[PDB]
């Protein structure tokens, strides 16, 4: 594919969809809900420690910067980020603690 | 006393269409692993590098 | 290959330790995928033969 000979730690976007980028966050509790779209990571970070369920959709992973930011803030291993950005692969399931 | 395993390693040549097979026969005995091949060069270079540079959990294991 | 890896996972000899037994599943699963892929490839080749047949018949018609 696009990556060949890279060490298994490099974050490359193998896909070819780079047209659009956005981030939508929907934080919903059995009481209320709050939805907002943006293109920044600072307003996405605080939801890690919120006990209420949250759904953070990063539409467009051509921006390796945002994926790296959210992965390193949410305690996501760089290998998992590489798997996210590596497009040409089988559906996978991995269980971390 | 040992576990004996026989595999084939396949190689494909571009500009032609021919499979070439090399038998690799490996025996696990008394915390050692013997390997038997017929050509120099194989497909286990990643394992060699991992053992060399303490990569992966192979070093911690038997 | 599938028989070898299934036998390596199914039933554990004293030489193989349980700690590494799940790892074999990985390669075993891999082997299964390989078979499927190879099986699929076979089908494709047959279809290729078939399409050629179709071609000549259609070509004949023309």
């Amino acid at each position: 594919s696009a990556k060949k000979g890279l060490p298994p730690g490099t974050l490359v976007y193998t896909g070819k969809y780079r047209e659009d980028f956005e981030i939508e966050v929907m934080n919903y509790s059995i009481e209320e809900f709050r939805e907002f779209k943006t293109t920044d990571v600072e307003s996405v970070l605080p939801f890690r420690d919120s006990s209420t369920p949250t759904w953070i959709n990063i539409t467009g992973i051509h921006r390796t910067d945002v994926v790296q930011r959210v992965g390193e803030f949410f305690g996501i291993h760089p290998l998992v980020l590489e798997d996210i950005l590596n497009v040409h692969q089988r559906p996978k399931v991995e269980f971390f603690e | 006393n040992y576990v004996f395993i026989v595999l084939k390693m396949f190689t494909y040549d571009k500009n032609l269409h021919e499979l070439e097979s090399e038998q690799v026969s490996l025996i696990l005995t008394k915390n050692c692993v013997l390997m038997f091949q017929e050509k120099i060069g194989d497909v286990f270079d990643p394992v060699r590098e991992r053992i060399r540079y303490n990569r992966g959990i192979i070093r911690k294991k038997r | 290959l599938r028989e070898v890896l299934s036998s390596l996972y199914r039933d554990v000899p004293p030489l193989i330790e349980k700690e590494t037994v799940p790892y074999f599943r990985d390669v075993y699963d891999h082997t299964i995928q390989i078979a499927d892929t190879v099986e699929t490839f076979r089908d494709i080749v047959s279809g290729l033969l078939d399409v050629y047949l179709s071609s000549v018949s259609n070509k004949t018609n023309e």
Partner: antibody
Amino acid sequence: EVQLVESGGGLVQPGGSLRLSCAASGFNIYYSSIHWVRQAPGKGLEWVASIYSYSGYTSYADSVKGRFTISADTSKNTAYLQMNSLRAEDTAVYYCARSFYVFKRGTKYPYYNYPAMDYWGQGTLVTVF
Amino acid sequence: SDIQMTQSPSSLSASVGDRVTITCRASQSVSSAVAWYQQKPGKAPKLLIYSASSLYSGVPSRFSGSRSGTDFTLTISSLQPEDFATYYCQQSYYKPITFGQGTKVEIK
């Protein structure tokens, strides 16, 4: 064989600019993460910055977020930490370190170690006065 | 909202060949991402333990690392006079890599 060294530590009048240079031998920084760590005299270690040079990703600490700027050079194979408008709290010994992790892929329960700084340079004193 | 890892004891007094344990606890579960570093006076800290249990290649096998939930411990079985230096507990799970406040082991 592999070793990191830091140079450029020097006295800076509060509000100045200063560039630290971390030169590494034995590995290419284009493929690895370079971490800048800070240690005030008598206090513990305080992580400053990190660069993943391949994607040009620069992560910073809150205390220097926007103030410092970390950037790598592959041709020179050197990681530079630029500072603008240094404050009083910035006086400390700075070190550059290489993070690493050993991993095994494939399993449904993969063994993914998290990166830990491995090789640290000798560090340099950065005094603000 | 960066993780704060509290490491205790703040100071440690011990003699040669003593079993000494320095424990650091993280506010959130950092899995097994904790590392233990040793720093000699006026020197670059060297990595003792990574992944909270594994022993680095090069360090003597004397040091040990244990994990229990959100608690991590660095243990020295037979302390040596060379091992009288500051010890730091680090997380690697989350974004700002945070160290412990430090622990200095001094001869008693």
